[PDB]
PDB file of C-alpha atoms and ligand atoms in Angstrom:
ATOM      1  CA  UNK A   1      39.818 -12.336  87.650  1.00 34.93           C
ATOM      2  CA  UNK A   2      41.614  -8.996  87.578  1.00 32.43           C
ATOM      3  CA  UNK A   3      40.636  -8.356  83.969  1.00 35.26           C
ATOM      4  CA  UNK A   4      37.019  -9.236  84.700  1.00 34.06           C
ATOM      5  CA  UNK A   5      36.893  -6.860  87.655  1.00 34.94           C
ATOM      6  CA  UNK A   6      38.247  -3.996  85.575  1.00 34.31           C
ATOM      7  CA  UNK A   7      35.667  -4.509  82.850  1.00 34.71           C
ATOM      8  CA  UNK A   8      32.928  -4.923  85.441  1.00 33.45           C
ATOM      9  CA  UNK A   9      33.892  -1.661  87.122  1.00 31.99           C
ATOM     10  CA  UNK A  10      33.904   0.078  83.755  1.00 32.30           C
ATOM     11  CA  UNK A  11      30.368  -1.119  83.047  1.00 33.11           C
ATOM     12  CA  UNK A  12      29.210   0.010  86.484  1.00 33.81           C
ATOM     13  CA  UNK A  13      30.672   3.435  85.748  1.00 31.18           C
ATOM     14  CA  UNK A  14      28.012   3.825  83.060  1.00 34.15           C
ATOM     15  CA  UNK A  15      25.392   3.811  85.840  1.00 33.28           C
ATOM     16  CA  UNK A  16      26.864   6.857  87.630  1.00 34.53           C
ATOM     17  CA  UNK A  17      25.306  10.300  87.306  1.00 36.21           C
ATOM     18  CA  UNK A  18      28.548  12.239  87.941  1.00 36.82           C
ATOM     19  CA  UNK A  19      26.371  15.129  89.079  1.00 36.36           C
ATOM     20  CA  UNK A  20      24.001  14.973  86.110  1.00 36.06           C
ATOM     21  CA  UNK A  21      20.231  14.649  86.398  1.00 31.91           C
ATOM     22  CA  UNK A  22      20.314  11.174  84.839  1.00 35.45           C
ATOM     23  CA  UNK A  23      22.843   8.514  83.882  1.00 36.67           C
ATOM     24  CA  UNK A  24      21.146   7.887  80.510  1.00 38.02           C
ATOM     25  CA  UNK A  25      22.001  10.248  77.663  1.00 39.21           C
ATOM     26  CA  UNK A  26      18.803   9.534  75.723  1.00 36.87           C
ATOM     27  CA  UNK A  27      16.690  10.408  78.762  1.00 36.36           C
ATOM     28  CA  UNK A  28      18.558  13.697  79.223  1.00 37.98           C
ATOM     29  CA  UNK A  29      18.243  14.638  75.552  1.00 39.64           C
ATOM     30  CA  UNK A  30      14.529  13.781  75.705  1.00 39.25           C
ATOM     31  CA  UNK A  31      14.040  15.804  78.906  1.00 40.21           C
ATOM     32  CA  UNK A  32      15.976  19.074  78.586  1.00 42.39           C
ATOM     33  CA  UNK A  33      16.613  21.842  76.093  1.00 43.38           C
ATOM     34  CA  UNK A  34      19.896  21.595  74.145  1.00 44.27           C
ATOM     35  CA  UNK A  35      21.688  24.316  76.176  1.00 43.74           C
ATOM     36  CA  UNK A  36      21.269  22.617  79.575  1.00 40.62           C
ATOM     37  CA  UNK A  37      21.544  19.170  78.006  1.00 39.61           C
ATOM     38  CA  UNK A  38      25.001  20.327  76.934  1.00 37.74           C
ATOM     39  CA  UNK A  39      25.991  20.919  80.570  1.00 39.54           C
ATOM     40  CA  UNK A  40      24.659  17.565  81.752  1.00 37.75           C
ATOM     41  CA  UNK A  41      26.287  15.726  78.842  1.00 35.04           C
ATOM     42  CA  UNK A  42      29.521  17.560  79.666  1.00 35.68           C
ATOM     43  CA  UNK A  43      29.484  16.213  83.218  1.00 37.87           C
ATOM     44  CA  UNK A  44      28.768  12.690  81.966  1.00 39.57           C
ATOM     45  CA  UNK A  45      31.543  12.940  79.358  1.00 40.76           C
ATOM     46  CA  UNK A  46      34.073  14.108  81.941  1.00 38.08           C
ATOM     47  CA  UNK A  47      33.205  11.255  84.287  1.00 35.89           C
ATOM     48  CA  UNK A  48      33.355   8.601  81.584  1.00 37.62           C
ATOM     49  CA  UNK A  49      36.635   9.925  80.172  1.00 38.43           C
TER      50      UNK A  49
ATOM     51  CA  UNK B   1       3.059 -11.375 115.810  1.00 38.84           C
ATOM     52  CA  UNK B   2       4.111  -7.727 115.483  1.00 39.72           C
ATOM     53  CA  UNK B   3       7.554  -6.381 114.656  1.00 39.12           C
ATOM     54  CA  UNK B   4       8.961  -3.018 113.626  1.00 37.13           C
ATOM     55  CA  UNK B   5      10.984  -2.190 110.521  1.00 37.82           C
ATOM     56  CA  UNK B   6      14.389  -0.507 110.432  1.00 33.24           C
ATOM     57  CA  UNK B   7      16.585   1.054 107.715  1.00 34.11           C
ATOM     58  CA  UNK B   8      18.893  -1.772 106.666  1.00 34.14           C
ATOM     59  CA  UNK B   9      21.103  -2.847 103.789  1.00 31.45           C
ATOM     60  CA  UNK B  10      20.202  -6.275 102.431  1.00 33.88           C
ATOM     61  CA  UNK B  11      21.920  -8.525  99.913  1.00 34.04           C
ATOM     62  CA  UNK B  12      19.168 -10.378  98.046  1.00 35.45           C
ATOM     63  CA  UNK B  13      19.840 -13.432  95.875  1.00 38.25           C
ATOM     64  CA  UNK B  14      17.447 -13.965  92.961  1.00 39.46           C
ATOM     65  CA  UNK B  15      17.063 -17.491  91.614  1.00 35.56           C
ATOM     66  CA  UNK B  16      16.747 -18.580  87.984  1.00 33.70           C
ATOM     67  CA  UNK B  17      12.979 -18.012  87.791  1.00 33.76           C
ATOM     68  CA  UNK B  18      13.156 -14.587  89.455  1.00 33.97           C
ATOM     69  CA  UNK B  19      12.153 -15.308  93.065  1.00 33.00           C
ATOM     70  CA  UNK B  20      14.161 -14.214  96.093  1.00 30.99           C
ATOM     71  CA  UNK B  21      15.613 -17.322  97.727  1.00 32.82           C
ATOM     72  CA  UNK B  22      18.117 -15.951 100.252  1.00 33.05           C
ATOM     73  CA  UNK B  23      19.223 -12.698 101.858  1.00 32.23           C
ATOM     74  CA  UNK B  24      22.009 -11.322 104.033  1.00 32.77           C
ATOM     75  CA  UNK B  25      21.525  -8.533 106.577  1.00 32.53           C
ATOM     76  CA  UNK B  26      24.733  -6.516 106.419  1.00 27.34           C
ATOM     77  CA  UNK B  27      24.617  -4.951 109.886  1.00 28.77           C
ATOM     78  CA  UNK B  28      23.776  -8.160 111.775  1.00 26.03           C
ATOM     79  CA  UNK B  29      27.265  -9.589 112.317  1.00 26.08           C
ATOM     80  CA  UNK B  30      30.812  -9.289 110.937  1.00 25.14           C
ATOM     81  CA  UNK B  31      30.407 -12.315 108.651  1.00 27.42           C
ATOM     82  CA  UNK B  32      27.295 -10.833 107.046  1.00 29.07           C
ATOM     83  CA  UNK B  33      29.113  -7.529 106.559  1.00 26.90           C
ATOM     84  CA  UNK B  34      31.988  -9.419 104.926  1.00 25.16           C
ATOM     85  CA  UNK B  35      29.504 -11.108 102.595  1.00 26.70           C
ATOM     86  CA  UNK B  36      28.011  -7.725 101.694  1.00 26.92           C
ATOM     87  CA  UNK B  37      31.473  -6.304 100.989  1.00 25.09           C
ATOM     88  CA  UNK B  38      32.405  -9.266  98.777  1.00 26.91           C
ATOM     89  CA  UNK B  39      28.888  -9.479  97.254  1.00 24.16           C
ATOM     90  CA  UNK B  40      28.769 -13.243  97.714  1.00 22.39           C
ATOM     91  CA  UNK B  41      27.057 -15.736 100.000  1.00 24.20           C
ATOM     92  CA  UNK B  42      30.219 -17.855 100.370  1.00 23.24           C
ATOM     93  CA  UNK B  43      33.440 -16.422 101.806  1.00 20.52           C
ATOM     94  CA  UNK B  44      36.777 -18.177 101.368  1.00 20.83           C
ATOM     95  CA  UNK B  45      39.517 -18.347 103.985  1.00 22.20           C
ATOM     96  CA  UNK B  46      41.394 -15.106 104.502  1.00 22.56           C
ATOM     97  CA  UNK B  47      41.302 -11.703 106.157  1.00 21.19           C
ATOM     98  CA  UNK B  48      38.961  -9.153 104.583  1.00 18.83           C
ATOM     99  CA  UNK B  49      38.843  -5.431 105.299  1.00 20.49           C
TER     100      UNK B  49
ATOM    101  CA  UNK C   1       0.370  26.514  90.707  1.00 19.44           C
ATOM    102  CA  UNK C   2       3.495  24.389  91.166  1.00 18.87           C
ATOM    103  CA  UNK C   3       3.529  21.197  89.055  1.00 15.23           C
ATOM    104  CA  UNK C   4       5.633  18.439  90.723  1.00 14.09           C
ATOM    105  CA  UNK C   5       6.681  15.421  88.590  1.00 14.42           C
ATOM    106  CA  UNK C   6       8.955  12.413  89.247  1.00 15.05           C
ATOM    107  CA  UNK C   7      10.915  11.097  86.214  1.00 13.29           C
ATOM    108  CA  UNK C   8      11.939   7.393  86.409  1.00  8.29           C
ATOM    109  CA  UNK C   9      11.329   4.451  83.983  1.00  4.09           C
ATOM    110  CA  UNK C  10       8.441   2.291  82.630  1.00  2.41           C
ATOM    111  CA  UNK C  11       5.950   2.406  85.612  1.00  4.55           C
ATOM    112  CA  UNK C  12       3.984   5.610  84.808  1.00  4.77           C
ATOM    113  CA  UNK C  13       0.260   6.529  84.770  1.00  7.78           C
ATOM    114  CA  UNK C  14       0.659   9.806  82.804  1.00  7.78           C
ATOM    115  CA  UNK C  15       2.007  10.204  79.242  1.00  7.55           C
ATOM    116  CA  UNK C  16       1.623  12.930  76.588  1.00 10.99           C
ATOM    117  CA  UNK C  17      -0.980  12.503  73.825  1.00 11.60           C
ATOM    118  CA  UNK C  18       1.586  10.633  71.645  1.00  7.85           C
ATOM    119  CA  UNK C  19      -0.310   7.805  69.881  1.00  7.73           C
ATOM    120  CA  UNK C  20       0.807   4.164  69.460  1.00  6.26           C
ATOM    121  CA  UNK C  21       2.467   1.986  66.787  1.00  7.46           C
ATOM    122  CA  UNK C  22       2.057  -1.762  66.341  1.00  2.00           C
ATOM    123  CA  UNK C  23       4.785  -3.993  67.737  1.00  2.00           C
ATOM    124  CA  UNK C  24       7.624  -5.149  65.479  1.00  4.91           C
ATOM    125  CA  UNK C  25       9.758  -8.177  66.332  1.00  2.84           C
ATOM    126  CA  UNK C  26      13.123  -9.515  65.137  1.00  2.04           C
ATOM    127  CA  UNK C  27      14.163  -6.121  63.731  1.00  2.00           C
ATOM    128  CA  UNK C  28      16.480  -3.498  65.197  1.00  2.00           C
ATOM    129  CA  UNK C  29      14.067  -0.649  65.963  1.00  2.12           C
ATOM    130  CA  UNK C  30      13.685   2.393  68.175  1.00  5.50           C
ATOM    131  CA  UNK C  31      11.147   1.805  70.932  1.00  2.68           C
ATOM    132  CA  UNK C  32       9.300   4.077  73.360  1.00  5.23           C
ATOM    133  CA  UNK C  33       7.706   1.668  75.836  1.00  3.85           C
ATOM    134  CA  UNK C  34       5.671   3.747  78.300  1.00  3.63           C
ATOM    135  CA  UNK C  35       8.378   6.359  78.753  1.00  3.48           C
ATOM    136  CA  UNK C  36      11.311   3.954  78.325  1.00  2.00           C
ATOM    137  CA  UNK C  37      13.244   5.193  75.285  1.00  3.97           C
ATOM    138  CA  UNK C  38      15.744   2.844  73.680  1.00  6.56           C
ATOM    139  CA  UNK C  39      16.914   1.054  70.560  1.00  6.25           C
ATOM    140  CA  UNK C  40      17.258  -2.687  70.108  1.00  7.57           C
ATOM    141  CA  UNK C  41      15.661  -5.841  68.809  1.00  5.04           C
ATOM    142  CA  UNK C  42      12.492  -7.061  70.514  1.00  4.15           C
ATOM    143  CA  UNK C  43      11.830 -10.788  70.813  1.00  2.26           C
ATOM    144  CA  UNK C  44       9.334 -12.974  72.616  1.00  3.49           C
ATOM    145  CA  UNK C  45      10.842 -13.958  75.953  1.00  3.27           C
ATOM    146  CA  UNK C  46      10.484 -16.960  78.238  1.00  4.60           C
ATOM    147  CA  UNK C  47      11.330 -14.890  81.326  1.00  6.95           C
ATOM    148  CA  UNK C  48       8.714 -15.405  84.036  1.00  6.80           C
ATOM    149  CA  UNK C  49       7.410 -12.045  85.260  1.00  8.32           C
TER     150      UNK C  49
ATOM    151  CA  UNK D   1      -1.535  17.873  77.619  1.00 11.77           C
ATOM    152  CA  UNK D   2       0.324  21.156  78.098  1.00 13.09           C
ATOM    153  CA  UNK D   3      -1.311  22.717  75.033  1.00 12.74           C
ATOM    154  CA  UNK D   4      -4.199  23.911  77.212  1.00 15.17           C
ATOM    155  CA  UNK D   5      -1.718  25.136  79.836  1.00 17.63           C
ATOM    156  CA  UNK D   6      -0.072  27.306  77.186  1.00 18.97           C
ATOM    157  CA  UNK D   7      -3.539  28.294  75.912  1.00 18.97           C
ATOM    158  CA  UNK D   8      -4.359  29.719  79.353  1.00 17.75           C
ATOM    159  CA  UNK D   9      -3.440  33.257  80.394  1.00 15.91           C
ATOM    160  CA  UNK D  10       0.092  34.548  79.688  1.00 11.99           C
ATOM    161  CA  UNK D  11       2.411  33.507  82.493  1.00 10.26           C
ATOM    162  CA  UNK D  12       4.531  35.947  84.480  1.00 11.25           C
ATOM    163  CA  UNK D  13       6.873  33.085  85.424  1.00  8.84           C
ATOM    164  CA  UNK D  14       6.991  29.705  83.648  1.00 10.59           C
ATOM    165  CA  UNK D  15      10.293  28.102  84.670  1.00  8.48           C
ATOM    166  CA  UNK D  16      10.992  24.368  84.427  1.00  6.32           C
ATOM    167  CA  UNK D  17      13.710  22.848  86.631  1.00  3.34           C
ATOM    168  CA  UNK D  18      14.224  19.115  85.991  1.00  7.16           C
ATOM    169  CA  UNK D  19      12.460  19.315  82.605  1.00  6.96           C
ATOM    170  CA  UNK D  20      12.073  21.751  79.670  1.00  8.30           C
ATOM    171  CA  UNK D  21       8.724  23.510  79.006  1.00  6.85           C
ATOM    172  CA  UNK D  22       8.509  22.453  75.334  1.00 10.07           C
ATOM    173  CA  UNK D  23       9.892  18.942  76.055  1.00 11.33           C
ATOM    174  CA  UNK D  24       6.791  18.355  78.238  1.00  9.64           C
ATOM    175  CA  UNK D  25       4.051  16.325  76.446  1.00 10.56           C
ATOM    176  CA  UNK D  26       7.050  14.196  75.427  1.00  9.45           C
ATOM    177  CA  UNK D  27       7.720  12.712  78.884  1.00  8.44           C
ATOM    178  CA  UNK D  28       5.925  10.178  81.138  1.00  9.40           C
ATOM    179  CA  UNK D  29       5.554  10.996  84.845  1.00 10.15           C
ATOM    180  CA  UNK D  30       4.856   8.774  87.897  1.00 10.80           C
ATOM    181  CA  UNK D  31       3.062  11.122  90.342  1.00 12.19           C
ATOM    182  CA  UNK D  32       2.005  14.626  89.225  1.00 10.13           C
ATOM    183  CA  UNK D  33       1.177  16.918  92.183  1.00 10.88           C
ATOM    184  CA  UNK D  34      -0.041  20.489  91.690  1.00 11.32           C
ATOM    185  CA  UNK D  35       0.117  23.005  94.548  1.00 14.00           C
ATOM    186  CA  UNK D  36      -2.086  26.092  94.173  1.00 11.34           C
ATOM    187  CA  UNK D  37      -1.636  29.223  96.285  1.00 11.34           C
ATOM    188  CA  UNK D  38      -1.730  33.020  96.050  1.00 13.85           C
ATOM    189  CA  UNK D  39       1.410  35.024  96.860  1.00 12.93           C
ATOM    190  CA  UNK D  40       2.639  38.559  96.285  1.00 13.72           C
ATOM    191  CA  UNK D  41       4.754  39.634  93.340  1.00 13.76           C
ATOM    192  CA  UNK D  42       8.112  39.708  95.108  1.00 12.22           C
ATOM    193  CA  UNK D  43       7.340  36.401  96.833  1.00 10.17           C
ATOM    194  CA  UNK D  44       7.305  34.600  93.464  1.00 11.68           C
ATOM    195  CA  UNK D  45      11.104  34.386  93.385  1.00  9.83           C
ATOM    196  CA  UNK D  46      11.205  32.641  96.766  1.00 13.96           C
ATOM    197  CA  UNK D  47       9.366  29.657  95.259  1.00 14.74           C
ATOM    198  CA  UNK D  48      12.424  28.109  93.599  1.00 14.02           C
ATOM    199  CA  UNK D  49      15.169  25.608  94.460  1.00 16.81           C
TER     200      UNK D  49
ATOM    201  CA  UNK E   1      -3.846  -8.850 125.472  1.00 17.16           C
ATOM    202  CA  UNK E   2      -0.894 -10.916 126.718  1.00 14.51           C
ATOM    203  CA  UNK E   3       2.592 -10.100 125.424  1.00 14.53           C
ATOM    204  CA  UNK E   4       5.223 -12.755 124.797  1.00 16.35           C
ATOM    205  CA  UNK E   5       8.481 -12.316 122.893  1.00 14.27           C
ATOM    206  CA  UNK E   6       9.934 -14.465 120.114  1.00 10.52           C
ATOM    207  CA  UNK E   7      12.576 -14.527 117.387  1.00 10.61           C
ATOM    208  CA  UNK E   8      11.701 -13.264 113.918  1.00 15.90           C
ATOM    209  CA  UNK E   9      14.403 -15.362 112.216  1.00 13.91           C
ATOM    210  CA  UNK E  10      14.826 -14.679 108.488  1.00 13.81           C
ATOM    211  CA  UNK E  11      11.229 -13.516 108.108  1.00 16.26           C
ATOM    212  CA  UNK E  12       9.920 -10.302 106.605  1.00 13.78           C
ATOM    213  CA  UNK E  13      11.779  -9.961 103.302  1.00 16.92           C
ATOM    214  CA  UNK E  14       9.943  -8.397 100.367  1.00 16.15           C
ATOM    215  CA  UNK E  15      10.582  -7.319  96.784  1.00 14.22           C
ATOM    216  CA  UNK E  16      11.840  -3.718  96.933  1.00 13.73           C
ATOM    217  CA  UNK E  17      11.269  -2.561  93.351  1.00 14.46           C
ATOM    218  CA  UNK E  18       9.127  -3.319  90.299  1.00 11.63           C
ATOM    219  CA  UNK E  19      12.107  -4.852  88.498  1.00 11.93           C
ATOM    220  CA  UNK E  20      12.657  -8.471  87.468  1.00 11.30           C
ATOM    221  CA  UNK E  21      16.161  -9.804  88.118  1.00 14.37           C
ATOM    222  CA  UNK E  22      17.346 -13.371  87.530  1.00 12.52           C
ATOM    223  CA  UNK E  23      20.435 -15.181  88.856  1.00 15.64           C
ATOM    224  CA  UNK E  24      21.851 -12.017  90.432  1.00 14.92           C
ATOM    225  CA  UNK E  25      22.845 -10.641  93.832  1.00 13.60           C
ATOM    226  CA  UNK E  26      21.417  -7.175  94.485  1.00 13.46           C
ATOM    227  CA  UNK E  27      22.085  -4.706  97.306  1.00 11.29           C
ATOM    228  CA  UNK E  28      19.109  -2.729  98.627  1.00 11.78           C
ATOM    229  CA  UNK E  29      19.008   0.030 101.247  1.00  9.67           C
ATOM    230  CA  UNK E  30      15.430   0.007 102.499  1.00  6.09           C
ATOM    231  CA  UNK E  31      13.138  -0.529 105.455  1.00  9.09           C
ATOM    232  CA  UNK E  32      13.307  -4.191 106.432  1.00  6.59           C
ATOM    233  CA  UNK E  33      12.730  -6.278 109.516  1.00  8.86           C
ATOM    234  CA  UNK E  34      16.201  -6.886 110.994  1.00 11.42           C
ATOM    235  CA  UNK E  35      17.120 -10.552 110.982  1.00  8.52           C
ATOM    236  CA  UNK E  36      16.925 -12.332 114.337  1.00  9.37           C
ATOM    237  CA  UNK E  37      15.055  -9.465 115.999  1.00 11.15           C
ATOM    238  CA  UNK E  38      12.665  -9.781 118.918  1.00  8.13           C
ATOM    239  CA  UNK E  39       9.015  -9.523 117.879  1.00  7.61           C
ATOM    240  CA  UNK E  40       5.974  -9.417 120.145  1.00  9.84           C
ATOM    241  CA  UNK E  41       3.403 -12.222 120.221  1.00 10.40           C
ATOM    242  CA  UNK E  42       0.060 -10.739 121.279  1.00 10.93           C
ATOM    243  CA  UNK E  43      -2.760 -12.929 122.559  1.00 11.63           C
TER     244      UNK E  43
HETATM  245  C1  LIG F 101      11.481 -21.810  89.391  1.00  9.05           C
HETATM  246  O1  LIG F 101      12.540 -22.133  88.479  1.00  9.05           O
HETATM  247  C2  LIG F 101      12.475 -23.484  87.999  1.00  9.05           C
HETATM  248  C3  LIG F 101      13.703 -23.706  87.146  1.00  9.05           C
HETATM  249  O2  LIG F 101      13.484 -23.292  85.804  1.00  9.05           O
HETATM  250  C4  LIG F 101      11.172 -23.705  87.236  1.00  9.05           C
HETATM  251  O3  LIG F 101      11.092 -25.066  86.830  1.00  9.05           O
HETATM  252  C5  LIG F 101       9.977 -23.353  88.113  1.00  9.05           C
HETATM  253  O4  LIG F 101       8.777 -23.430  87.353  1.00  9.05           O
HETATM  254  C6  LIG F 101      10.131 -21.946  88.682  1.00  9.05           C
HETATM  255  N1  LIG F 101       9.031 -21.634  89.581  1.00  9.05           N
HETATM  256  C7  LIG F 101       8.322 -20.503  89.500  1.00  9.05           C
HETATM  257  C8  LIG F 101       7.223 -20.344  90.507  1.00  9.05           C
HETATM  258  O5  LIG F 101       8.556 -19.648  88.652  1.00  9.05           O
HETATM  259  C1  LIG F 102      13.878 -10.132 122.992  1.00 10.18           C
HETATM  260  O1  LIG F 102      14.520 -11.372 123.316  1.00 10.18           O
HETATM  261  C2  LIG F 102      15.896 -11.237 123.700  1.00 10.18           C
HETATM  262  C3  LIG F 102      16.426 -12.633 123.923  1.00 10.18           C
HETATM  263  O2  LIG F 102      15.856 -13.226 125.082  1.00 10.18           O
HETATM  264  C4  LIG F 102      16.005 -10.353 124.940  1.00 10.18           C
HETATM  265  O3  LIG F 102      17.378 -10.162 125.262  1.00 10.18           O
HETATM  266  C5  LIG F 102      15.337  -9.009 124.689  1.00 10.18           C
HETATM  267  O4  LIG F 102      15.331  -8.238 125.885  1.00 10.18           O
HETATM  268  C6  LIG F 102      13.903  -9.210 124.208  1.00 10.18           C
HETATM  269  N1  LIG F 102      13.281  -7.932 123.906  1.00 10.18           N
HETATM  270  C7  LIG F 102      12.584  -7.231 124.805  1.00 10.18           C
HETATM  271  C8  LIG F 102      12.013  -5.930 124.326  1.00 10.18           C
HETATM  272  O5  LIG F 102      12.422  -7.627 125.954  1.00 10.18           O
END
């Protein structure tokens, strides 16, 4: 059970914006210019790390 | 019959074919709130925060 | 003139002039389904919508 | 199609918040609203998040 | 019109989003009719 929960939580953490406009990287890179996309991707990277 | 809606948190259970078959209103009673916290319609014996 | 959008997923009544491409099944492909951008393999499904 | 929007008169202020000017025509939107009004030059800056 | 009062029971639940979900439990914050709430019968 414990292991499952951990993995489950990890998967749910992929659905968190962490302050970014979207939780999907492809949507961000298809929505914003590379400079601001860098900032949003940076927030997502920090959260996921 | 006329009733009025309210902002509520519901736990909805979807069946195999995709239709909602049961729901739990979190703010109704302590047992329903426990179910919402555990994300299950059955609660085993114990004390749950 | 202030243009107000809402960015979400599939359900959308407005897209850019981008044309279409015939469906491909059982191959790992990039897909843009009505604003939903992803990559995967597309198969016929028995899910009841 | 934002090609005609660009083809209209040169814009004193064309700033895109959620999205990126050029990345428009590449997105798919749920409810476009446009608000038209006439304001003074210094009042343009006040129309911003 | 004559007003009586009755119990709504577990009535008034609707699909919140345009998303198909199967064999899952989903939590939704939305406007719903509270369970076991008093509703008015008008004649
Ligand atoms: C509900 O699911 C059962 C189990 O597969 C299926 O036989 C039935 O056709 C489904 N009903 C509807 C309305 O989808
Ligand atoms: C609805 O019914 C309950 C149970 O009898 C009662 O306590 C409550 O006062 C009723 N609602 C109104 C508005 O009278």
